Amino acid sequence: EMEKEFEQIDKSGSWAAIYQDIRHEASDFPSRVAKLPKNKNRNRYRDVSPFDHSRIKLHQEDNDYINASLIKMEEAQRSYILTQGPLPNTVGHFWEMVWEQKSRGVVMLNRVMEKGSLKCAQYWPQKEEKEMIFEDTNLKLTLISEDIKSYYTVRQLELENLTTQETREILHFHYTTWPDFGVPESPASFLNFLFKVRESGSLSPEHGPVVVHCSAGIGRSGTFCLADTCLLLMDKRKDPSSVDIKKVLLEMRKFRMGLIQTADQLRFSYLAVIEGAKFIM
Numbered sequence: 459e460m461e462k463e464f465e466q467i468d469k470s471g472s473w474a475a476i477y478q479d480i481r482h483e484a485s486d487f488p489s490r491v492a493k494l495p496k497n498k499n500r501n502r503y504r505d506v507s508p509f510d511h512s513r514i515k516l517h518q519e520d521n522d523y524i525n526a527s528l529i530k531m532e533e534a535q536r537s538y539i540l541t542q543g544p545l546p547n548t549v550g551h552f553w554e555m556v557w558e559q560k561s562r563g564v565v566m567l568n569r570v571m572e573k574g575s576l577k578c579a580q581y582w583p584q585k586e587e588k589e590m591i592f593e594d595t596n597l598k599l600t601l602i603s604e605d606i607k608s609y610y611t612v613r614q615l616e617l618e619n620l621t622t623q624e625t626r627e628i629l630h631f632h633y634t635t636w637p638d639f640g641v642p643e644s645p646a647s648f649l650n651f652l653f654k655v656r657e658s659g660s661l662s663p664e665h666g667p668v669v670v671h672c673s674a675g676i677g678r679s680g681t682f683c684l685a686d687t688c689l690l691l692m693d694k695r696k697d698p699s700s701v702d703i704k705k706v707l708l709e710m711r712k713f714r715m716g717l718i719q720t721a722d723q724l725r726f727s728y729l730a731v732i733e734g735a736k737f738i739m
């Protein structure tokens with residue numbers, strides 16, 4: 459059981475050591491499309507690339523490339539699209555992907571500015587009356603409502619395909635209190651946030667996969683998917699303590715490189731799953 463394994467690694471201070479075995483054991487697959495010169499300005503970080511096998515393709519004939527990966531968790535019956543915070547020049551691609559994949563939710567785990575630098579383009583409208591048009595992808599986005607709480611904000615958005623005049627409601631879940639350095643002290647507000655996303659239906663098989671991002675789409679985004687999948691496997695299995703976090707992380711790393719960036723994020727993931735299990739048993 460992970461609670462005992464937690465105390466062991468903690469009392470022995472072996473988090474860097476565990477984290478390094480995961481690094482060593484992690485899959486490495488080609489990411490050739492990401493490295494084409496014509497895609498250089500579609501990537502926020504040159505060392506964070508989707509694998510060719512799991513990459514989301516835009517349905518535009520010109521250039522189908524976005525920095526985004528489909529993570530398919532077969533046993534949990536859960537999919538996620540992990541992506542980078544959009545760039546000024548990829549905001550239109552981002553909303554095209556949301557449209558094409560029939561996503562119901564967008565989960566944002568960063569602030570637009572952290573440590574005095576921009577981590578993300580402002581890719582949604584700030585006021586009801588000031589809608590955004592993406593000319594390149596022929597999409598209109600409107601803020602319908604905004605519910606600001608202490609730890610997160612939920613926004614209702616309307617996405618309109620200007621080509622076909624179809625419209626969809628998208629939910630934007632924005633966790634606003636992840637600290638600039640390190641991880642939250644307690645996983646309570648993160649778990650609350652996760653249960654809120656679940657309650658919306660955004661993670662449900664009726665809909666396309668949820669879009670999850672932070673700045674690179676590997677660190678905080680990683681913790682979100684790892685926690686959700688581990689808690690769901692604990693509901694589903696005859697023996698809940700058969701769930702090995704490290705195994706689940708390695709399975710997710712076949713789909714996108716670098717998920718969980720630090721030993722601190724790994725420790726936090728254990729804590730999130732351990733605490734979430736109480737509210738599930």
Ligand SMILES: Cc1cc(C)nc(Nc2ccc(N)cc2)n1
Pocket residue numbers: 545546547549550579580589590591592593
């Ligand atoms: C109608 C309207 C008015 C304004 C000021 N912007 C937009 N669209 C937009 C496109 C690309 C980026 N990066 C950001 C915004 N659309």
